[PDB]
Each structure stands twice: as structure tokens, then as C-alpha cells.
Amino acid sequence: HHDSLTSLPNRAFFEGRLSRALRDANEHREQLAVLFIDSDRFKEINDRLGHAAGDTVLVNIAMRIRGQLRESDLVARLGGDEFAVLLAPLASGADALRIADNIIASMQAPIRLSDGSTVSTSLTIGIALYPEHADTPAALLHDADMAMYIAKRQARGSRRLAELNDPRILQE
Ligand SMILES: [Mg+2]
């Protein structure tokens, strides 16, 4: 199924694909990346400007994310302003960073609202590499999830790689 707003698959889909892609990427001794994406200032937008505005921003974000992928990559909508992105196959971690950087830069452009006004926001992106960080869907997902949290907390609108001491940084 694909959500009616943005036409994007849901987590259930995303996990299976990631599973299949992980089994695959293991076999050919190759790399893949998971990106966890959360919009910045979302609640503020809906409060100050209302559902319709929010939805518009979601649709835009969705369009801009897919704008930066290759036919082989996958965007799912987790829920809310939050999306999951599968980057397979991958030449290098560098590549993942670079794509993230482009998704981030994509947001420098303002978003046209239904009344012709304009909002600017950011995304925050946590990135988790295979096989450097984890080797199971659940784990990889979790790691990206956490990296994103840490990123929102450290500086909004940025991308951050999962580190191995991430649970210690979460604890402190
Ligand atoms: Mg948000």
C-alpha cells in the first residue's frame, strides 16, 4: 500500500525491501545505506499555518527526496514528517553522505503554499551504513533512527552518521 497523500510505501514495505537488499548486499560483499529523515519545525508549521500547509510541505519534501535518489533507491513514509530511505547498491559511504547533503541542500528552496505564500524549513538526516554499523534490518533502522535524534538535538537541518558509541551518547 502507498499513503494517499504522498503515494509513498509504508514501513512494512520498507523493511521487506531492506531485508531483501541486505541479504543481497551481503552476498556480493557490497554496501548499502539507510537514511532516517525528519522535517524540522513541523508542529510549528501546522500550529501557525494549519493542516493544509503541513500537507503541502510533506508533499514537497517527499518530491524533493525522490528528486535526489536513483531508480534503484527507495523512499517510504514512516509516519508524520518522517521518512525512511534505502540507498542500494552503494559504491561508498561517501556516496550516502553526498546524497544526504543533496537532500539537505534541496531544502534551501522555499515551498509555495496554497495561498501563494512561502515557507522555508530543514530536514534532519541520520545515516546508518552497511556493513560498518549493523547487519540486520532492525539494527540498521534503529541506528539511523538514533543518529537522527542525536542530529536534531545537536544541530537541526544536518546529516549525521551513526557512531559505535551512539548508545553512550544517548545515555549522556
Ligand atoms: Mg519535526
Author numbering: 250 to 421
Please give the exact wording used by the authors of the publication that reports this structure.
Bacterial biofilm depends on the modulation of cyclic diguanylate (c-di-GMP) levels in response to environmental cues. The GGDEF domain of DGCs is emblematic of this control; since only one GTP molecule can bind in the active site, a dimerization step is mandatory for the cyclization reaction to occur and yield c-di-GMP.
Since the dimer formation is a pre-requisite to enter DGC catalysis, we investigated the possible GMP production of the isolated GGDEF of YfiN from P. aeruginosa, an inactive truncated version, previously shown to be a monomer able to bind GTP with high affinity. According to our hypothesis, the kinetic data clearly shows that the GGDEF domain of YfiN displayed the side activity accumulating GMP, while c-di-GMP production absent. The versatile reactivity of the GGDEF domain seems to be related to a conformational issue rather than to an altered active site (as compared to the catalytically competent site required for DGC reaction): this may explain the alternative reactivity of the same protein towards GTP, depending on the allosteric status of the protein. This hypothesis has been confirmed by solving the 3D structure of the YfiNGGDEF protein in complex with Mg2+ by X-ray crystallography at 2.8 Å resolution. A magnesium ion is bound in the GTP binding site, coordinated by the oxygen atoms of D287, S288(CO), D330 (belonging to the GGDEF signature), and two water molecules. The GTP substrate docks to the GGDEF domain in an extended conformation and a side reaction leading to the formation of c-GMP can be excluded given the position of the 3′-OH, which is too far from the α-phosphate to perform a nucleophilic attack. For YfiN, the conserved active site, confirmed by structural data, and the high affinity for the substrate are not sufficient to promote DGC, given that the conformational activation is hampered by the upstream domain(s) truncation. Despite that the GGDEF domain is evolutionarily conserved and structurally stable, its function is strictly dependent on the neighboring domain(s) or sequences that, independently of their nature, are required to ensure the proper dimerization to enter DGC catalysis.
